[PDB]
Symmetry: C2
Subunit: 478 residues, 2 copies
């Protein structure tokens, strides 16, 4: 009798299964195209734990092997296929069993699937998984939401396969009801986008300033040694920059500049907008990708107006990590990244208030420390900040010191990049605005726009001295 | 019999009624609280066209008086209010009649309504209207869409009431089917958001640079005479700036910095994101308002980190429009505004192909020339530009000259404001990135990010030299 069943042998599904197999649990496996199951069993025939790997043919056979209550991690990356798979399962399953969708769809869909199901007798759980291929095999992070009782049943299996933080804690924790887990995964992917784009801009900026791919890597490597930015994403950027083609040249130069995406980012942007929390970096991260996808249009515009974007340029006198400007960039990045995290958490906090998940923010953040793509040093003090005072106005307050120290440098660096370089910095730019705007008591432009709306729409405006709305009597303008 | 009916007497309802009856048509009126109709016919009983106005009892009556096919213009608040009203009408009308919704619905709802109604034997028309209270009376712009059949039946009343642009052409045209008209209005409101914000930013910047409310007015005033920026919104900004409170001080100083919104801008942002078209200025326009609504949080953040946004500052030598700095700020705005319109139009271009509206852009953009909020000089050359080459890659090229000339000024100003001023410039900033990004053939950050996605997710990447997708082999990182 199998302890758990894993549905869908993808990048994640197969690695995850192994991980759980190696942890000692007997796992029934199942794929759409049985053939793949074969190839799978093949490449892993020799593993020392291949005895815990039972492959199957028919759902109905697969379902009987699992110890009641069955437990099935649906690892089929889809939207539709996930619903299709849920139907197959739902039929061959019995009252009480569990269906865990580790899927990657809108938290709103999870609220649906769950609700139908409980009324149909089966128990559901929407759970996120971050770590990628390696993370899946070695130990990712999970972000569950759903029935409180369902968690306790599954806890042993996931706590064992989760990555362990520097404090022995497994990076998994019940985040709250319904789609709470899928929401956290969504916003996680949201911050991921903003951060990857930040590194990407750094690359573009340094290249513009005269550094070649190797010299860039040395500054990333220096920044890694300074510790504050130590992160997975930083590591992969270094790999990405040093990478070389078969012909011995930098890979990056042969890469078509069009960034694909699969939606998590897009939705987080739309919901942030929906509920109304300001998250400029999260949006511009998606917009920045949209920029690339329009390769054809950009090429046409260029032809129509040759070198219109031309600037004076700025070639670096000191291409070494200790150079004055490179230190200016460093601070920029540190703050920029901090604001990305800030916005990400503010969205989550607000999302809890609105959907009432009963989210335990400091418990959730703690599970970001390893396995997931967002892992890195900064997660330590951020976890502590939210542990120390859970009702903090905003995450940036906790870093008031760091921020004061580099804010001017942040301002100078983008001022210089803007006037002198021929590079677009969507995210680095939006992030600075987030910082300046969020620490400003009175935004004057809000006074003007507020009045304007009254001029044509007669919407009225709030006053700082009275109460209620006031509407001004305006002269005709046509 | 009656020429046409109007339901709902908001700021828009009443005025449009008078607009229409003044033009020679008999207009049946209805409303929920018959009191409101009483108050309407009340205040307007002396008008030389009152005999072309008739307040009604019930829909039985209202629908009774109208020349068949009944044509009704619903003018109530969007949402459930509209839904109800259409249902009441539905009972009291007959095969062939026409329901013209004109109250700001998300273009997807209109397309649905169209079908509902079309399967029930009635005709529907989603028809946006813009111009505000004054414009509603003097003649605004209309953005209709749905069945062509209805259009030619309504063309007289809407043409006669709409504003006429220079060439004497009225600001109305059939925009396409279904929700094509509401879509145009949605994006019209989206450009409006961005541009209002740009003026608001100008106010903030000059105030920061030392100008008092009356001195900025003089700058705008000079900008108007330069003609290129002549626009409605410019005019109202001037009024807004000049306005004084009963205590004889500037109104803006007593205004609560919180910008309300009603959705159209929000959705335009979400759909632009959805179809994937890059509209950074349209997106940040909504965010900038979000920034203001978080007044409480901003106030708290400021208390926990006093003087954190403290900057060098920059006071101007001459507060006269002849000031060199004021001159570059001018180029900045010109260019900023041009990209706003550009983004707006690209959104519609793609919207049309995805949703197959059969929209004729040059006809559509021509109806924006007068009556609507976005009206101004620029709409003239822009209209020409699209009549000249309908499949021009991006409107920005048609303005290559002006861009080439002011681009560095635009960069230097933004650089200056970023470095020295204690103000946030969300949209002036995003718009500059839109310009630099859209004219750049190769965005290098796209190369890094592209590869990054491969590292962890094994998503592969497109090559500029091979064709298809490739995936590299990477070192373990954990």
């Amino acid at each position: 009798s199998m302890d758990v069943g894993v549905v869908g042998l993808g990048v994640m599904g197969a690695n995850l299964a192994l991980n759980i197999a190696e942890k000692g649990f007997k796992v029934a496996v199942f794929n759409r195209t049985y053939s793949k199951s074969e190839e799978f069993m093949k490449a892993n025939a020799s593993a020392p734990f291949a005895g815990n790997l039972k492959a199957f043919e028919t759902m109905e056979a697969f379902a009987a092997s699992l110890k009641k209550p069955r437990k099935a991690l649906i690892l089929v990356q889809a939207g539709a296929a996930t619903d299709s798979t849920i139907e197959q399962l739902k039929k061959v399953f019995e009252k009480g069993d569990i269906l865990v969708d580790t899927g990657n769809a809108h938290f709103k869909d999870q609220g649906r699937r769950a609700q139908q199901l409980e009324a149909a007798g089966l128990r559901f759980l929407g759970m996120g998984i971050s770590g990628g291929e390696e993370g899946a095999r070695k130990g990712p992070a999970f972000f569950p939401g759903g029935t409180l009782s369902v968690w306790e049943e599954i806890r042993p299996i996931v706590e064992a396969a989760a990555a362990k933080a520097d404090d022995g804690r497994p990076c998994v924790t019940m985040n709250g009801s319904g789609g709470a887990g899928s929401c956290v995964k969504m916003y996680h992917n949201s911050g991921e986008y903003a951060i990857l784009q930040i590194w990407g801009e750094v690359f573009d900026i340094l290249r513009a300033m005269g550094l070649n791919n190797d010299e860039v890597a040395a500054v990333l490597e220096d920044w890694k040694s300074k510790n504050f930015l130590k992160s997975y994403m930083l590591d992969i950027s270094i790999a990405a920059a040093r990478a070389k083609d078969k012909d011995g040249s930098y890979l990056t130069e042969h890469v078509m500049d069009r960034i694909g995406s699969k939606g998590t980012g897009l939705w987080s942007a739309q919901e942030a907008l929906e509920i109304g929390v300001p998250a400029p970096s999260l949006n511009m991260a998606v917009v920045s990708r949209q920029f690339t996808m329009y390769k054809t249009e950009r090429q046409a515009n260029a032809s129509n107006a040759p070198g219109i974007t031309q600037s004076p340029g700025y070639t670096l006198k000191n291409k070494s990590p200790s150079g004055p400007e490179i230190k200016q960039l460093y601070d920029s990045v540190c703050i920029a990244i901090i604001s990305c995290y800030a916005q990400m958490f503010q969205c989550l906090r607000e999302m809890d208030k609105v959907h009432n998940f009963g989210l335990n923010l400091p418990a959730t953040i703690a599970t970001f420390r390893a396995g997931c793509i967002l892992q890195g040093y900064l997660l330590k003090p951020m976890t502590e900040a939210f542990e120390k005072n859970p009702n903090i106005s905003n995450l940036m307050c906790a870093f008031q010191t760091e921020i004061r120290a580099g804010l001017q440098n942040y301002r100078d660096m983008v001022a210089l990049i803007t006037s002198k370089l021929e590079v677009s910095i969507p995210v680095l730019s939006a992030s600075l605005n987030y910082v300046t705007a969020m620490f400003t008591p009175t935004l004057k432009y809000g006074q003007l726009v507020s009045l304007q709306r009254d001029v044509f729409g007669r919407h009225g405006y709030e006053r700082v001295d009275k109460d209620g709305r006031e509407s001004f009597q305006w002269p005709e303008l046509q």
